[PDB]
Design a protein around this ligand. Structure first.
Ligand SMILES: CCc1cc(CC[C@]2(C3CCCC3)CC(O)=C(Cc3nc4nc(C)cc(C)n4n3)C(=O)O2)cc(CC)n1
Length: 562
């Protein structure tokens, strides 16, 4: 069936959309080639519509059925519970889209009577009606990128499809516990969202080392959400139903599947019918879990079809990497074509075709790779990094323009051991926070799709707890990593190391001069910049720090605030 059908009504904005990075003295000090940075807007929604609209063909074989049986068996060991209306209300982000029924996210978090009474009504109706399609809104994502002259053209806006606020609270009630618990039980060590960046590195390295002649590849499904069929969504539901659930949870999950997850009508911001969806909704609670399970199922079965030798998967939504034993270069290339043939058969045809990699460092998964540096003792050590272009482009935008969720703070947290986050992101943003006297202001950021309020001054103990003390003393980064960063700096017109070190020394001295938590930021975050390194010792606040709840599950599109 077609992933979408369209009426002709436009995907509309409801406010101004800015497409060009503004000229701003603060962002210019970070990167001067502002014309390389752009944001997606509703003006390219039609381009995206064309790309995501296609007919899906799917055939299922024994390998698929076998894997599915195994998955269901593990799922049958899971017990999940309903959230109360209050517990669900409290998971709603403060800036979550307001209801069309006369209330907003503040009213939900405040447990206002209008909000809470409406949520109750929505739930009752889910129980009473398991057929009528639930309305969704479709909007164009506004996201920031750098131009890629080599790829030929710019990225069009992604589309987000989401039901009303009251429905979203109901999804939490029925499914938050399931989507939080089930993926790891079903997929075990292959479920990527259980890992911090350090733990993902450890898994990838240990997995690579476990093969005699390792080969790895990432598999890029073309528009994954669009490839998800009604069968797939019903298969997902059948896995959820393997859990030990309360009778009302079972009914709510069935109703949500029939009326929301399988498909339904699409309404623009102006209330006009834009069309109909028969694929994954990008903005529901089950998007991440659903995609992860389905990607895992198809890939696992495809591994068996291609006769890949000792294949280990790492899956995060639609993002997939496979590490296995090489059978030789020609044999590996052929195997990857069979794997791709099988994925296609299962309705996950490829974007870029997979290519075998024999150096773990060159495998990009979840837009990131393993790299090497040295700690203070000189020990060669592994850490997670990525190409810094998108992080820097977004940091420039977020410097010039106030944004709901910043990405720069999440990037500092996740990529704290990297040379680019330390050299550029920490230096830039602490300089800004100093100037504005906003070091003390908590900021919203995202980790694995979930929103968190984080205090910049707590960054030293967060980083220690997450990455270890070595994060403040890594050095001797790989030539490839250094070169990748230097290329990006030239491309974006970012200042060189000499300038960031001078900036960092000044930021550091100011921080130290202020005392308290500010001084601890100066000492630990910027120790790299000074000639005479201080001895960094364990931060007491770090040993009372529980960050495990940050790396439980993915929630991208799922409207979660922790
Ligand atoms: C693309 C810009 C660039 C960056 C770098 C990395 C420089 C830098 C990073 C910048 C941020 C965090 C650290 C700074 C920096 O000063 C060093 C040098 C260093 N720091 C140490 N610390 C200890 C304990 C022990 C040793 C031997 N070193 N050696 C580094 O390796 O990395 C190197 C180069 C090539 C010179 N170019």
């Amino acid at each position: 069936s077609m992933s979408y059908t369209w009426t002709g009504a436009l995907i509309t904005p409801c406010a101004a959309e800015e497409s060009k990075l503004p000229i701003n003295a603060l962002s210019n000090s970070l990167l001067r080639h502002h014309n390389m940075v752009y944001a997606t807007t509703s003006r390219s929604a039609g381009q995206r519509q064309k790309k995501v609209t296609f007919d899906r063909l799917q055939d299922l074989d024994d390998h698929y059925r076998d894997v599915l049986k195994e998955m269901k068996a593990k799922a049958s060991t899971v017990k999940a519970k309903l959230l109360s209306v209050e517990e669900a209300c409290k998971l709603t982000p403060p800036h979550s889209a307001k209801s069309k029924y006369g209330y907003g996210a503040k009213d939900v978090r405040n447990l206002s009577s209008r909000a809470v009474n409406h949520i109750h009504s929505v739930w009752k109706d889910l129980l009473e009606d398991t057929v009528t399609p639930i309305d969704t809104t479709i909007m164009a994502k506004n996201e920031v990128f750098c131009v890629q002259p080599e790829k030929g053209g710019r990225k069009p806006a992604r589309l987000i499809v989401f039901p009303d606020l009251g429905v979203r609270v109901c999804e939490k009630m029925a499914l938050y516990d399931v989507v939080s618990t089930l993926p790891q039980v079903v997929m075990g060590s292959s479920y990527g969202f259980q890992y911090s960046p350090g733990q993902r590195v450890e898994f990838l390295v240990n997995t690579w080392k476990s093969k005699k002649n390792p080969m790895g590849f990432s598999y890029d499904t073309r528009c994954f959400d669009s490839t998800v069929t009604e069968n797939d969504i019903r298969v997902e539901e059948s896995i959820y139903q393997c859990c030990d659930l309360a009778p009302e949870a079972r009914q709510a999950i069935k109703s949500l599947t029939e009326r929301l997850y399988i498909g339904g009508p699409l309404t623009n911001s102006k209330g006009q019918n834009c069309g109909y969806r028969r694929c994954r909704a990008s903005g529901v609670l089950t998007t991440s879990c659903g995609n992860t399970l389905t990607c895992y199922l198809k890939a696992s079965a495809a591994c068996r079809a291609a006769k890949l030798q000792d294949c280990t998967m790492l899956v995060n939504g639609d993002d997939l990497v496979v590490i296995c034993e090489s059978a030789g270069t020609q044999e590996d290339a052929a195997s990857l074509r069979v794997f791709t043939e099988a994925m296609t058969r299962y309705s996950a045809p490829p974007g870029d075709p997979p290519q075998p990699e024999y150096d773990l460092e060159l495998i990009t998964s979840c837009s990131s790779n393993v790299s090497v540096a040295h700690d203070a003792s000189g020990k060669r050590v592994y850490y997670l990094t990525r190409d810094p272009t998108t992080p820097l482009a977004r940091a420039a935008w977020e410097t010039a323009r106030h944004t709901p969720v910043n990405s720069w703070l999440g990037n500092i947290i996740m990529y704290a051991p990297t040379l680019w986050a330390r050299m550029i992101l920490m230096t830039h943003f602490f300089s800004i926070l100093l100037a504005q006297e906003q070091l003390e202001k908590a900021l919203d950021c995202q980790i694995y799709g979930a929103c968190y309020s984080i205090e910049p001054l707590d960054l030293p103990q967060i980083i220690e707890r997450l990455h270890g003390l070595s994060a403040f003393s890594l050095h001797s980064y790989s030539p490839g990593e250094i070169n990748r960063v230097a290329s990006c700096l030239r491309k974006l017109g970012v200042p060189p190391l000499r300038v960031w070190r001078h900036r960092a020394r000044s930021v550091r001295a100011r921080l130290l001069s202020q005392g308290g938590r500010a001084a601890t930021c100066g000492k630990y975050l910027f120790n790299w910049a000074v000639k005479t390194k201080l001895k960094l010792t364990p931060i007491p606040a770090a040993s009372q720090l529980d960050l495990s709840g940050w790396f439980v599950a993915g929630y991208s599109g799922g409207d979660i605030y922790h």
